[PDB]
Amino acid sequence: FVNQHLCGSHLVEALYLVCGERGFFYTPKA
Amino acid sequence: GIVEQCCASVCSLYQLENYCN
């Protein structure tokens, strides 16, 4: 599900699912 | 950055995992 264009809430959802209890950082400007 | 790599272009697991804590 990760190997596609992932934009906005879809990108944050993929980070959420992939990173699990690690959490993640979402920095769209940088 | 993540938008250029994963939104404007096709994402990958290697690249997404780089944003995990």
Side-chain angles (χ1 to χ4, degrees):
Chain A
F1 55 101
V2 160
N3 295 287
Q4 65 180 123
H5 292 91
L6 299 166
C7 292
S9 65
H10 303 198
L11 182 56
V12 162
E13 178 167 296
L15 283 161
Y16 173 74
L17 287 171
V18 157
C19 297
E21 75 164 66
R22 295 180 273 175
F24 59 86
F25 58 101
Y26 173 60
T27 64
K29 248 33 262 203
Chain B
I2 193 173
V3 171
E4 294 62 45
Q5 299 315 324
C6 278
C7 173
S9 300
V10 174
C11 199
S12 69
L13 185 61
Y14 177 104
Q15 280 189 285
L16 232 32
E17 282 197 332
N18 280 334
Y19 295 102
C20 301
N21 296 135

